[PDB]
């Protein structure tokens, strides 16, 4: 399972690429979604490769971001351990996190918005004109790499 | 053979066995084919249908297994062909086959030929087949009369030992008569 964050805007981006992000529930910059590692999903992320940051996050990081930026399908309600326990199959954020990571369920299945609306990266990211292997922030990241980004956008 | 661009004919065209232009036309009817084939000594008749991996023969008769019913004469003649046709035709009927189109392969549509005798036989067996009566022999020749008379110009038996000296178109009737009722494999 990979974490998807749009880092580049819609202006001037191919339409077929924009619709792809939209099918992955991201409609704004800094919006994140969690995607299972399947053939179907893999092709989609490859197509979006140049306007996004993605990678497999650590259990911890996912928990921090889930707690901090997860939302119900509808409403303000904070998604904390109690919420998770009183609304999902799991007993706490950690349990949900693990299930997501092991691709056993999805944010929607558990009554949560498929989108984690992140905050801009505190300290700024590495740039949206170059990929990771060049010092930029676009493309596939290290688990440590994704974690840094996700945590700076916590 | 000569290179990458060289065109090699379909196998059965190489073997000079199948006329594909005639085959297509034959298959147009959507009906089973009455395959009439000859050999120096025998005459074969098959009712073939189309299949996913090749033709399917649903019924057949060979001039050899004619003796199996009382044939004691040569098997490469007119009376032989007719009977083989009738025999295959009967087996055809038993198999639930009601109609067919005559496929004479690479043979020639010569009037009174053996392939047409085969066709006559199959039709009398009950098989409905597109035909033309005045392209068939005049019964007597089918019976084998032309050969009996030929032996009349004897001086030396037309048949080396075989059966009879003056031959028998009567043996023909006895057999046809036989095939038209009961008996095994029919």
């Amino acid at each position: 399972m990979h974490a998807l964050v749009q880092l580049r805007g819609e202006v001037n981006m191919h339409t077929d690429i924009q619709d792809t992000l939209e099918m992955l529930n991201i409609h704004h910059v800094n919006h994140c979604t969690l995607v299972p590692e399947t053939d179907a999903y893999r092709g989609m992320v490859a197509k979006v490769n140049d306007f996004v940051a993605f990678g497999e996050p650590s259990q911890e990081t996912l928990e921090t971001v889930l707690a901090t930026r997860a939302e119900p399908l509808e409403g303000d309600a904070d998604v904390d351990d109690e919420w998770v326990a009183e609304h999902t199959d799991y007993d706490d954020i950690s349990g949900l996190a693990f299930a997501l990571l092991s691709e056993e369920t999805t944010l929607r299945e558990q009554g949560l918005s498929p989108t984690l609306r992140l905050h801009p990266p505190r300290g700024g990211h590495d740039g949206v004109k170059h990929p990771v292997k060049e010092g930029g922030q676009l493309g596939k990241h290290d688990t440590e790499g994704i974690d840094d980004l996700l945590e700076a956008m916590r | 053979a000569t290179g990458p661009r060289y065109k090699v004919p379909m196998r059965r065209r190489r073997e000079a066995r199948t006329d594909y232009h005639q085959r297509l036309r034959l298959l147009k009817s959507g009906k089973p084919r009455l395959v009439a084939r000859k050999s120096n000594k025998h005459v074969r008749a098959q009712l073939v249908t189309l299949g996913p991996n090749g033709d399917d023969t649903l019924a057949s008769a060979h001039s050899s297994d004619l003796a199996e019913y009382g044939w004691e004469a040569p098997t490469g003649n007119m009376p032989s062909a007719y009977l083989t046709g009738l025999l295959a035709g009967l087996r055809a009927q038993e198999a639930g086959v009601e109609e067919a189109v005559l496929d004479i392969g690479l043979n020639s549509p010569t009037p009174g030929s053996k392939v047409f005798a085969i066709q006559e036989g199959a039709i009398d067996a009950g098989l409905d087949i597109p035909h033309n009566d005045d392209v068939l022999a005049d019964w007597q020749r089918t019976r084998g009369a032309h050969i009996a008379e030929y032996d009349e110009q004897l001086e030396e038996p037309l048949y080396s030992g075989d059966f009879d000296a003056a031959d028998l178109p009567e043996h023909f009737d006895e057999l046809r008569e036989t095939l038209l009722d009961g008996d095994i494999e029919l």
Binding site: - | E15, A16, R17, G105, L106, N107, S108
Partner: protein, 140 residues
């Protein structure tokens, strides 16, 4: 093995390549059976522009009709060698050609499952000279 490997005469073609006939008559008597017209192909200067057009006749003789003919034709010829086919044929003379081959030739002349005669089973110039020379005359 032999008997089915030994040569034999298959047709002798006597033809008079005239250029426009009355010649048939002699061909009929020299051979014994009707002659056949010889149409020509292509338009050419020898005032022979007509495509379909009688310009000679030929006669293909087989069996006895061929022997009974060669039993007078050969004697009227001397030549041999070099003037022989690579397939064991030879033409001399009014032309008189002799096509020679062995027993299983029908295999390449019939309609069903026809086939081209293997090089080995073909008749060589030499194996030809022998057969004929061994029939009322001499080679070279």
């Amino acid at each position: 093995f032999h008997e089915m490997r030994e040569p034999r005469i298959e047709k002798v073609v006597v033809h008079m390549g005239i250029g426009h006939a009355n010649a048939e008559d002699i061909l009929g008597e020299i051979t014994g059976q009707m002659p056949v017209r010889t149409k020509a192909k292509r338009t050419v200067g020898e005032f022979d522009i007509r495509e379909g057009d009688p310009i000679g006749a030929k006669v293909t003789l087989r069996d006895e009709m061929a022997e009974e003919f060669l039993q007078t034709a050969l004697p009227l010829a001397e030549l041999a060698t070099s003037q022989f086919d690579d397939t064991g044929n030879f033409s001399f003379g009014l032309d008189v050609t002799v096509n020679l081959v062995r027993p299983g030739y029908r295999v390449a002349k019939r309609d069903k499952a026809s086939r081209s005669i293997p090089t080995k089973h073909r008749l060589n110039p030499a194996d030809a000279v022998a057969f004929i020379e061994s029939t009322y005359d001499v080679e070279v």
